[PDB]
Each structure stands twice: as C-alpha cells, then as structure tokens.
C-alpha cells in the first residue's frame, strides 16, 4: 500500500537561560525507526527499529552531525520568533517541524512535505507545488518573504524529492519483514449489568496492528448509530493497540445485539454477541 | 494551551492475582511540559516507566505512562496529571470494564 | 537520512 517517511522536529526554548532541548524522530510508515535528543548523556541520532541496526558507523555520525546544525537553526530562528511575537526569553517556547515523502504502492513519489508551528499552532508550510509557500499571519509572511529572498524552497525540493524517496526506498528493502507485519484483533464481548434491567454490552477489540480499525454494534441486522460509546484507539505497550465499542439501551433482551470488527489483517470480518 | 486527554487502563484483560501492566495515555497536549503520577491507593508507584516524547500530525504531544501491577478486588489504581492549560490536577482511576 | 534546513525563520 502507500509508504511515508517523516521527521518531527520540536524545539523547545528554557526559560532557566539555557539552550533549548532538541528532538528529532524520524518515522518510516507511522513508526519510529530513528531518534535523537540534545538532553540524552551523549547526544546522537539513534536506532529505534531493529533493521535499523544495519547502518554504520558513518551513518550514525553523518545524521548526528546534521542534527547539530538543526539545534543551531532552532536556536536562530526561535530567537527571531521572538522578536516578530513581542515575546519574553523569560517565557518557555515551542518551535515544531514536519517534513518528508509519501510515496505510492509502486514506491513513486506522491508528494513532499513540509510544515511549521510556532506554540503548538501552523506558522508556515510549503505547498503541495514544493515552489511557494503559505504563512498563517502577519508574522509568518515575515518569514514567507526572507525565504522567497533566500530561495529556500528550492533546497527542501531536491531533498524532498531527492534523497527523502532514494532513503525511504532503502528502509522500506531492509525493513521488508518488519514492516510488512500486521497483527488481527482477538474481540469480546462483557456485560455489565446497568440500573432498571438496562444491561450495557462493550465489544473488546485487542492485540491489533496498525491502529485503523472498525467496530459497530447492530439490532437484528441494523447497525447501532445514537447510543454507541466508542474509546479512542489506544496502545497497548507492546506495539499493538486497543479499542472498545459500548451499547447500552439493550434490556433482559441481548442476543439482539451483535459486534462486528473490520480490520485489513483479519482473514474475514468478526462478528460476535454472548453474556 | 491544550487540554490533556488520559486513558488509564491495563496491557492485557485483569485477572486477578496475574501480573500485568499499567497504561496511563495523556494525549492532545501543548505545552510539552506535563507531569503524570500512577497512584496505587492514593499513594505515588516508584518505577513509572515513561515513552519518549512525541507529536502527533495536529501539533499536541502525547506519552505513555506505564507501570508493573497485579490486580487484585481491593487494590485501586488511578493517574494524575499536572498541566498548564488545567487550574488543577486532573485524576482518572483504573475501571477493569473501561 | 533528515535534511539541513536554509535560511533561519
């Protein structure tokens, strides 16, 4: 199916005078595979997935050394922030950046990526076009207008269409097992006997990878719309997920009421009811 | 200042007297700066294992708090959280049916 | 492999 590479870079600004904290996760399909931070012992970029592990030395080196000179950007650029914003050092502040590559199930580029927030909220992004960029207020053109000065978007469009594709290419081949693997839903169904007769019935969804799922509850054939309690998806801890899906309106009248489970690694739709 | 969003619940289904695992989930958060507690009897559990930071695609930040327990009939569990965006701590207490 | 960004904000 479709493929993605992604980083998340954040950096924060320590009121303390300090210098910011730095981190850099980098994502291969929604999981991390690399990490770096600048409050580790040694700061340095480091492997997150076990095929990463195949990457040498001068790798390793290479990406620590490129992060360097983003804790530098950072550093620069949330102290200009602070200027257009008429904002205090004394404050704590959030610089966050998304960039990368989505590619199709050939593994042909569908698109380049990258965007900006300044206290959690959009600053600048660079359109789909990866030629002009969009500011999000008058502070943000700031920035839009040194950039179109700078020809920056040039440079994050050769890296975008570039070596972002030419890397997730290679992770994608040496981390064929790893990410090829899903893991199917193990549902259930608990009953919790509620006030007047007014049993609440909650289908269980568990163990299941990736975290897209679908759960619904049907009276005789006819899914449950109003009353349905859905949880949001959670994790598990060990690299699955978690789901609940809760009926209340059924009585002393339960066989009525049935679950179902869409999920792209079960070999068939579940469908159950019970207790 | 957004809002966080907890989710205490175990690893795997209780059974009583089996060791499992703890999961506090606090999502939909900015400033990254929170602090979380897991709470056995209204009393701090020393050895709270934390993941990394992390952002989702919307910006806010989210981590998971996760601690060894064996459930037992008695024994309550709850999470509290403590954030800039909230006048005061917010707690969530361990449900086995949720 | 992450990217070097350009001009500072």
């Given at each position: 199916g479709p493929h993605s590479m992604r980083y998340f870079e954040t950096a924060v600004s320590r009121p303390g005078l300090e210098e910011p904290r730095y981190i850099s996760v980098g994502y291969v399909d929604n999981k991390e595979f690399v990490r770096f931070d600048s409050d580790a012992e040694n700061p340095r970029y480091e492997p997150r997935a076990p095929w990463m592990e195949?990457?040498?030395?001068?790798?390793?080196?290479?990406?620590?050394?490129?992060?360097?000179?983003?804790?530098?950007?950072?550093?620069?650029?949330?102290?200009?922030?602070?200027?257009?914003?008429?904002?205090?050092?004394?404050?704590?502040?959030?610089?966050?950046?998304?960039?990368?590559?989505?590619?199709?199930?050939?593994?042909?580029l569908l698109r380049g990526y990258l965007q900006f927030a300044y206290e959690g909220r959009d600053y600048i992004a660079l359109n789909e076009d990866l030629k002009t960029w969009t500011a999000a207020d008058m502070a943000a053109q700031i920035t839009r207008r040194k950039w179109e000065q700078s020809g920056a978007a040039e440079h994050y469009k050769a890296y975008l269409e570039g070596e972002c594709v030419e890397w997730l290419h290679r992770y994608l081949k040496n981390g064929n097992a790893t990410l090829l693997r899903t893991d199917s839903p193990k549902a259930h169904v608990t009953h919790h006997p509620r006030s007047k007769g007014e049993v609440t019935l909650r289908?269980?969804?568990?163990?299941?990878?990736?975290?897209?799922?679908?759960?619904?509850?049907?009276?005789?054939?006819?899914?449950?719309?109003?009353?349905?309690?859905?949880?949001?998806?959670?994790?598990?801890?060990?690299?699955?997920?978690?789901?609940?899906?809760?009926?209340?309106?059924?009585?002393?009248?339960?066989?009525?009421y049935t679950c179902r489970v869409y999920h792209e690694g079960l070999p068939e739709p579940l469908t159950l009811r019970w207790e | 200042?957004?809002?966080?969003?907890?989710?205490?619940?175990?690893?795997?289904?209780?059974?009583?007297?089996?060791?499992?695992?703890?999961?506090?989930?606090?999502?939909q958060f900015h400033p990254p700066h929170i602090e979380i507690q897991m709470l056995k009897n209204g009393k701090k559990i020393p050895k709270?294992?934390?993941?990394?930071?992390?952002?989702?695609?919307?910006?806010?930040?989210?981590?998971?708090?996760?601690?060894?327990?064996?459930?037992?009939?008695?024994?309550?569990?709850?999470?509290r959280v403590k954030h800039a965006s909230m006048a005061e701590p917010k707690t969530v207490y361990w449900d086995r049916d949720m | 492999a992450s990217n070097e960004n350009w001009e500072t904000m």
């Open positions: 195949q990457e040498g030395p001068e790798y390793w080196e290479r990406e620590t050394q490129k992060a360097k000179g983003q804790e530098q950007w950072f550093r620069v650029s949330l102290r200009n922030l602070l200027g257009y914003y008429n904002q205090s050092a004394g404050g704590s502040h959030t610089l966050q950046q998304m960039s990368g590559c989505d590619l199709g199930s050939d593994w042909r289908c269980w969804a568990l163990g299941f990878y990736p975290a897209d799922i679908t759960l619904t509850w049907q009276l005789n054939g006819e899914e449950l719309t109003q009353d349905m309690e859905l949880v949001e998806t959670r994790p598990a801890g060990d690299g699955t997920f978690q789901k609940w899906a809760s009926v209340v309106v059924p009585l002393g009248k339960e066989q009525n | 200042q957004k809002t966080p969003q907890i989710q205490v619940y175990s690893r795997h289904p209780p059974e009583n007297g089996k060791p499992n695992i703890l999961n506090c989930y606090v999502t709270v294992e934390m993941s990394d930071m992390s952002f989702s695609k919307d910006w806010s930040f989210y981590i998971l708090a996760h601690t060894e327990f064996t459930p037992t009939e008695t024994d309550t569990y709850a999470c | -």
